Structure formats: structure tokens, C-alpha cells
Amino acid sequence: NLTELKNTPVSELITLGENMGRKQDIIFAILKQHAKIFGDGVLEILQDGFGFLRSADSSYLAGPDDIYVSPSQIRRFNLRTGDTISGKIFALLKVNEVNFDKPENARNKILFENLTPLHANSRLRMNGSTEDLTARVLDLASPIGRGQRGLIVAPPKAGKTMLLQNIAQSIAYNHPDCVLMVLLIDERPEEVTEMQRLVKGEVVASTFDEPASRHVQVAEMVIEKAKRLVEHKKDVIILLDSITRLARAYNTVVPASGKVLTGGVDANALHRPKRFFGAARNVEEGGSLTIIATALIDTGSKMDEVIYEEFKGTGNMELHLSRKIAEKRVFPAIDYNRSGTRKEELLTTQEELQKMWILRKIIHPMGEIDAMEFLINKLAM
Amino acid sequence: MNLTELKNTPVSELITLGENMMRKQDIIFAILKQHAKSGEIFGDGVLEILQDGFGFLRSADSSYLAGPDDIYVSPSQIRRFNLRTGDTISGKIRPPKFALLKVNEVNFDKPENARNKILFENLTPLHANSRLRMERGNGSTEDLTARVLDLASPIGRGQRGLIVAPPKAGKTMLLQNIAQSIAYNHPDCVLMVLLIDERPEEVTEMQRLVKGEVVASTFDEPASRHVQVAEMVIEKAKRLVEHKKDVIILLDSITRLARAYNTVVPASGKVLTGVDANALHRPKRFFGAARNVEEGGSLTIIATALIDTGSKMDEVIYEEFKGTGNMELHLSRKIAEKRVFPAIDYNRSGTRKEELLTTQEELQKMWILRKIIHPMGEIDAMEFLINKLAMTKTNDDFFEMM
RNA sequence: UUUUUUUU
Numbered sequence: 001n002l003t004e005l006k007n008t009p010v011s012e013l014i015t016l017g018e019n020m021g022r023k024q025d026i027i028f029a030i031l032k033q034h035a036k037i038f039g040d041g042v043l044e045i046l047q048d049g050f051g052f053l054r055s056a057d058s059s060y061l062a063g064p065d066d067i068y069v070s071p072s073q074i075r076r077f078n079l080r081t082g083d084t085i086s087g088k089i090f091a092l093l094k095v096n097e098v099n100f101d102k103p104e105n106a107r108n109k110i111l112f113e114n115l116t117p118l119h120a121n122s123r124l125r126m127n128g129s130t131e132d133l134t135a136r137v138l139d140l141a142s143p144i145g146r147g148q149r150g151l152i153v154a155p156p157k158a159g160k161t162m163l164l165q166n167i168a169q170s171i172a173y174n175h176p177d178c179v180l181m182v183l184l185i186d187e188r189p190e191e192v193t194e195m196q197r198l199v200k201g202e203v204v205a206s207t208f209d210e211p212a213s214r215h216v217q218v219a220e221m222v223i224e225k226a227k228r229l230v231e232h233k234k235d236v237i238i239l240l241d242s243i244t245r246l247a248r249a250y251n252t253v254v255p256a257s258g259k260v261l262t263g264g265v266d267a268n269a270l271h272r273p274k275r276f277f278g279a280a281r282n283v284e285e286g287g288s289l290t291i292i293a294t295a296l297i298d299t300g301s302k303m304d305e306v307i308y309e310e311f312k313g314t315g316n317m318e319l320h321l322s323r324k325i326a327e328k329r330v331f332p333a334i335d336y337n338r339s340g341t342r343k344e345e346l347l348t349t350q351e352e353l354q355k356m357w358i359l360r361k362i363i364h365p366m367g368e369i370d371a372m373e374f375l376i377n378k379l380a381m
Numbered sequence: 382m383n384l385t386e387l388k389n390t391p392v393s394e395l396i397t398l399g400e401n402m403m404r405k406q407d408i409i410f411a412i413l414k415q416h417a418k419s420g421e422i423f424g425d426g427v428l429e430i431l432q433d434g435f436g437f438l439r440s441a442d443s444s445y446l447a448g449p450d451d452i453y454v455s456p457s458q459i460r461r462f463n464l465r466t467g468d469t470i471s472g473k474i475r476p477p478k479f480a481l482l483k484v485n486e487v488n489f490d491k492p493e494n495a496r497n498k499i500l501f502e503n504l505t506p507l508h509a510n511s512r513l514r515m516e517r518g519n520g521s522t523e524d525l526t527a528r529v530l531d532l533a534s535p536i537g538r539g540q541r542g543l544i545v546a547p548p549k550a551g552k553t554m555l556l557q558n559i560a561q562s563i564a565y566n567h568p569d570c571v572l573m574v575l576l577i578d579e580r581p582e583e584v585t586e587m588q589r590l591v592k593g594e595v596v597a598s599t600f601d602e603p604a605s606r607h608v609q610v611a612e613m614v615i616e617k618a619k620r621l622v623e624h625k626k627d628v629i630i631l632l633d634s635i636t637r638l639a640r641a642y643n644t645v646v647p648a649s650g651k652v653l654t655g656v657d658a659n660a661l662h663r664p665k666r667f668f669g670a671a672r673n674v675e676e677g678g679s680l681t682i683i684a685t686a687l688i689d690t691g692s693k694m695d696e697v698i699y700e701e702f703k704g705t706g707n708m709e710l711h712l713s714r715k716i717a718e719k720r721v722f723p724a725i726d727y728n729r730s731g732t733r734k735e736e737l738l739t740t741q742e743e744l745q746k747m748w749i750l751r752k753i754i755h756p757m758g759e760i761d762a763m764e765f766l767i768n769k770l771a772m773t774k775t776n777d778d779f780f781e782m783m
Numbered sequence: 784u785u786u787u788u789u790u791u
């Protein structure tokens with residue numbers, strides 16, 4: 001297999017080359033010998049109508065190990081960008097599986113654009129450890145359902161990272177069934193490696209050093225891959241940090257329209273990020289697409305307030321985190337009043353909803369710090 | 382006999398030496414051309430591969446720019462030793478019928494062992510894990526800046542920090558205090574000082590103040606020279622990191638370098654509010670090179686960021702580099718107007734994953750210290766911190782008091 | 784590109 005041999009180290013590999021008779025050249029020499037053989041990747045349809053099976057390790061960037069894909073092969077299995085393909089092969093000879101299933105079942109399916117959207121019906125419940133405090137307060141402040149289109153807004157240094165890592169940890173802890181993949185846009189090289197090591201799932205990232213077009217290309221590869229899995233009635237969950245920097249990437253790419261909104265945002269810049277984030281939806285036909293992206297506020301940048309206020313009219317769930325709490329050093333740093341979930345009565349039971357409604361009423365008059373302090377002590381006992 | 386050592390020597394010693402065997406640049410050349418006819422010549426410089434395939438060894442005194450003393454390097458040597466831009470080369474040369482015949486050393490190492498090495502892009506990035514204490518312990522007045530720096534924002538190997546402050550707040554003075562602490566405390570690290578589009582009195586001072594390599598480009602120089610100089614410095618840094626060397630670049634400033642790119646880069650398809658789109662990516666490649674290598678070595682970059690200048694272009698450069706650095710040291714103008722140095726904003730200063738740079742107790746006592754200072758104003762906080770540290774000679778003895 | 788928008 002091409003992918004497994006790329007993962008294989010040169011030390012173990014070179015021994016095989018001796019028994020058979022650069023790593024990218026030593027591998028191509030071992031691959032050609034056996035021909036006298038399989039590979040996989042994620043499809044990307046070019047402008048000629050052709051395709052390339054990008055590799056997740058290369059972050060779906062144009063690589064040499066990509067497998068050429070014929071247009072006729074797209075015509076037969078109705079393949080589109082984002083589909084996962086595994087078959088014998090560089091040129092793609094034959095396909096064995098499309099989206100982890102038989103290719104004959106992929107030909108007949110409802111397109112993602114035709115799936116009937118709905119409000120999150122099913123609930124994503126979030127050991128007694130100290131890390132469970134952030135997750136237990138989350139269920140109370142803003143419930144999350146399948147297809148939820150929510151944000152994690154907070155000032156810098158507050159702990160946007162710690163909250164996403166805690167959510168991802170609880171997703172694979174309570175919902176191993178749901179497909180979890182973490183997207184990082186304009187992320188720091190030290191923070192991406194840390195992410196890959198403590199999270200259970202796929203991690204697609206794009207360092208801050210990458211160009212804006214790269215941030216856009218990566219994000220659209222992941223979001224399209226999710227749409228394909230939802231067409232197969234699977235529950236997908238995407239964790240992005242952050243939607244704010246991704247919107248700035250689209251604001252850098254979008255052609256200048258001559259009109260500039262407040263904060264310095266182009267008038268046509270927020271359409272594409274609105275479709276990426278708006279792709280998250282609940283489907284009755286089967287499966288769902290959940291997106292939890294962090295939003296930056298109180299950063300001193302007027303541009304980030306316009307972005308947040310715009311995506312707020314696009315999403316339906318928000319979990320605010322206070323900086324004054326991060327200064328007090330207490331966690332979780334959550335602004336209970338500002339937090340909230342739309343159509344929350346569907347995800348929670350009647351008893352649960354009444355107990356949550358009566359709770360918010362008591363916390364509303366309280367201050368930000370005193371509210372979290374009372375909640376942390378009530379959950380500890 | 383040496384080309385660089387012959388142009389470095391004064392004219393008086395050069396002419397008298399030439400009489401035994403006109404402009405200085407032709408005196409040295411005439412001495413070399415006659416010394417070649419005697420049957421006996423060596424040169425050195427930093428490699429720069431041109432678009433044509435061949436490269437020329439740029440000299441440091443020329444700030445890595447084209448010079449009549451530059452040595453031609455055939456495409457052959459580039460293939461034999463897999464040479465890339467930034468490689469320092471030292472071998473015997475010859476006058477043109479200048480050209481290099483044989484290299485004796487590549488990147489201060491033997492050509493053979495240097496041919497095969499892991500690329501810089503393949504190196505894996507990590508959080509800084511080796512602390513770089515700045516306080517010299519001399520008890521000098523300058524140590525106050527380094528002591529407050531260690532308590533506010535710790536620095537490590539592969540650190541990527543920013544000295545953010547308004548004009549005339551003490552950022553250039555900060556790098557002077559850092560370079561002195563890098564040479565005094567960590568002489569093992571390779572120290573390079575890059576001064577982009579700044580005052581000409583500040584480059585001459587920087588050269589006499591700290592021992593190392595000061596590569597600069599005053600505001601007398603075009604914006605095209607600012608970029609090229611920075612390109613040569615960063616590539617040289619990457620080559621040294623490939624030899625597992627701990628490199629530390631002190632840039633001043635990142636804003637001025639980002640402005641030079643915007644002026645040089647061909648008009649982007651779109652112009653953001655005015656700075657170009659593709660123009661801001663190039664500085665991110667220079668500043669993003671800073672990282673901690675798991676395989677070995679590191680690349681530290683501490684550049685100064687300019688704010689509150691009344692320029693939208695400066696505020697855009699800062700917004701794009703704000704969340705980039707894992708280390709930030711803010712300076713206040715109000716503290717500087719009161720002439721209270723170091724004029725540091727202790728509350729906004731801090732570093733990411735600093736629990737890897739400080740001991741458990743240290744990190745705890747630093748957190749207690751930040752809690753006490755948090756309510757205070759920025760001027761009251763610094764005068765309070767300087768006072769507590771004045772009672773002590775070293776930060777450690779200051780810790781035990783708490 | 785300028786002005787308008789960004790922008791007060």
C-alpha cells in the first residue's frame with residue numbers, strides 16, 4: 001500500500017528494499033518492482049474534470065504521492081470533492097471502497113444540497129475529574145446537538161484552546177460513533193503538534209505561515225469531506241480554531257468590491273465563510289454535520305466584532321468565556337448569561353429544561369465571577 | 382593570504398605591503414593578481430544562488446549584497462555539495478582571466494559531512510523547553526531590565542517573541558539589553574542582529590555594544606535592500622539550525638520589514654485596507670522560521686513590533702503578527718514619559734506554555750506576583766516592581782523573600 | 784490605485 005509505505009520509516013523500509021532488490025524515490029522504486037498494489041486518499045476534482053487523491057498527512061496539499069483520477073471514474077460513481085477512495089493503483093487503476101463502503105451504494109444517494117435540514121434533535125451530552133467541570137457547565141449553559149452550528153467566543157489568553165481540547169476529549173469519550181476531525185486555520189506550529197498528540201481523530205491544520213489561499217483551500221477540503229459523509233448518513237463533528245482567522249483569510253482572498261463594512265471587512269468577504277460555517281446542519285434523511293468554531297472578541301480589533309456579530313446571525317449556539325475570570329485564574333471561565341442555545345427545549349427533557357431555566361434566572365443577577373464560583377462549588381458537591 | 386582579510390586591513394598596511402610585491406579595491410586586487418603569478422589565495426562569504434543557477438559569495442561588510450569582491454560559484458559545486466542559499470563557504474579562489482576552485486569548509490564544517498543533512502523544512506517544531514535566563518546577576522543598572530523580563534515573559538530556545546510598544550518606548554534599548562544578556566549568559570548561542578530600515582546611529586552603536594554579527598540596513602537604503610538583507614540573514618540562520626546550532630535573531634523591527642515588502646512586492650490582485658495581501662505573507666515566512674527543533678538545535682527570533690503610531694498600516698501589520706508570536710513583551714509610553722525604565726507593561730506581557738521554561742515553584746511565585754500587580758496601574762506596577770527588586774541583587778534571593 | 788467606503 002502506498003500510504004502504509006509512506007508511514008513506514010526508512011530504517012525498516014530499506015531492509016525490505018534489500019530483500020526485494022530519498023524516501024520518495026526509494027518508495028517509488030519498491031512500488032514499481034511489485035507491479036511486475038493499492039493506495040488511497042481524498043478526491044479533489046480539478047478544472048480539467050480530472051482528480052487527485054490528496055493525502056491527509058500533507059494536509060490535503062498538492063503532493064507528489066497523489067493518485068491521478070480519471071474523469072470517467074468520476075462519471076461512473078458520481079464522485080465529488082471530499083470523497084474518500086481506496087483502490088489498487090501514480091494512476092488509479094480500480095476502486096474498492098468509496099467513503100468506507102461499496103462503490104455501488106455510493107451511486108444512489110441524496111445530494112447534500114437536497115438533504116432536508118432540521119434543528120438539532122439528538123443531544124451530544126458532554127468521571128468526576130476536574131476537567132469535567134468545563135464539560136458539565138457546558139451542558140447547563142448551552143446544549144449541543146447533532147448538526148449544531150455553535151461558536152466558542154472568548155478574549156485571547158482566556159482558554160479557547162483548553163475548551164476545544166476538552167470538548168474533543170469528551171466527544172471521543174461519549175460519542176466514538178461520531179466522526180471527529182479537528183481543523184486548525186492560521187494556527188501556531190507549536191500548538192498544532194500538541195493538538196495531534198492528545199486528540200483522538202484526524203487533525204487537519206494550516207500554520208500561520210501559510211498563505212491565505214492555503215487556509216481557504218484546506219478549510220474547503222475538510223468541509224466538503226464532511227458533506228460526503230453526511231450523504232452516507234454519518235454524524236460528523238468539526239472543531240475549528242478559529243472561524244475568525246478563517247474569515248480574515250477569506251477577506252484577504254475575496255476580490256475588492258469597492259465597498260468596505262465597518263471594521264475593515266470587505267462587503268463580499270463574509271459570504272464564503274458563511275457557507276463553510278453554514279454547512280453544519282441536522283438532516284432527517286440520516287446523519288448530521290456539527291461545527292464548533294471559536295470566535296475572537298474583546299481583542300482590540302473592530303474587525304473581529306463585525307465577524308462575530310455576523311456569524312451569530314448564522315449560528316444557533318454560543319458559549320462565552322470571560323477574561324475577568326481568566327484573570328481570577330478560576331476555571332471554567334464561562335459567562336453564563338451571554339451563553340445560550342437556540343431551540344434548546346428539543347435537546348433537553350422537560351424536567352431538565354425546567355431545572356436549567358430556573359437556574360439561569362438565579363445566575364442572571366449574579367456577577368460573572370460569583371456566578372461561576374457558585375456553579376463550580378455546586379458541581380463539586 | 383586572504384581576500385576578506387586583505388580588504389579588512391587598512392590602506393596604509395595595504396599599500397606598503399603592495400610596494401614589496403590607486404583605489405583600495407584595486408590595491409587588494411593588484412596584490413592578489415601578483416600573488417597568483419608568484420605561484421601562491423583564499424576567500425570566503427555567504428552563498429546566494431541566483432535564478433540563473435549560479436551563485437556568488439556575498440560579503441558581510443557589503444551586508445550580503447553584490448560586490449566587486451564576490452566569488453563566483455559554478456553550478457557544479459551546488460550539485461556536488463547540494464548547496465542552498467545561506468551556506469557559508471571558505472576555500473581557495475583565483476582572479477578572473479573572482480572564481481572558486483575548491484571549498485575547504487561549508488558552514489564551518491567539513492564539506493563531506495555537510496553534503497548529507499536533514500532539511501530545515503523537515504525539522505519538527507515544538508514548544509520552547511530550554512530556558513534562557515536574561516538576568517546577568519552583575520548587579521548592574523541594566524540588569525533591572527533583564528530581571529523584570531525574566532519575571533514577566535520568559536524566553537527559551539526556538540522562542541518566537543515580539544517587543545510591542547509605541548515609538549520612543551524603549552524597544553531598541555530592550556534588544557540592546559537582550560544581546561548583552563545573550564552574550565553574557567549564553568555565549569554558546571549564535572547571535573545575529575538584524576536592523577531593518579532604522580536610524581544610522583543605531584546600527585553603529587549596535588555594532589560597538591554587543592559582540593556578534595550585526596547585519597543592518599539603515600533608512601538611507603531602498604526598500605528592495607531591506608528585503609534582500611533579511612532574506613540572506615534568515616536563510617543563513619536556517620542553514621546553521623540544520624547543523625543543530627542554537628540560533629538567535631534579534632530583529633528591529635518587524636513592522637519596518639513588513640513595510641519594505643509591501644513596497645517591493647508586485648501589486649497584488651487585491652489591496653487590503655493600505656497593505657497588500659501577498660505582501661504580508663513574506664514577513665510571516667521570515668518570522669515563522671522561529672521554532673524549537675526536536676531533532677536538534679533551535680531558531681529564536683525576538684523582533685520589535687510598533688503600535689500606537691497613528692498609522693493604520695502599522696496596526697494591520699501588528700494584527701497579523703499579534704497571535705503569531707508565543708512570547709510578548711509590551712512597553713508603555715506613559716511609563717516612558719515618566720522616565721521610569723524599563724517601561725514594561727507587566728500585565729500584557731507573558732509567554733505561552735511558560736510552565737516548560739520555569740520550575741514549578743518559580744511558575745507559582747510568578748503567578749502570585751502577577752496577581753498582586755494585576756490591580757495596579759501600569760506606572761504603579763513598574764515602580765512597585767523595580768522597588769522590590771532594588772532590595773535584591775538576583776531574582777532568586779527576591780523569590781525566597783516571598 | 785486617489786476621492787467615496789474604511790472613519791470616528
Ligand code: BEF
Pocket residue numbers: 547548549550552553687
Ligand atoms: F521610534 Be522607535 F524606535 F519605535
Ligand SMILES: [Mg+2]
Pocket residue numbers: 552553554
Ligand atoms: Mg527603535
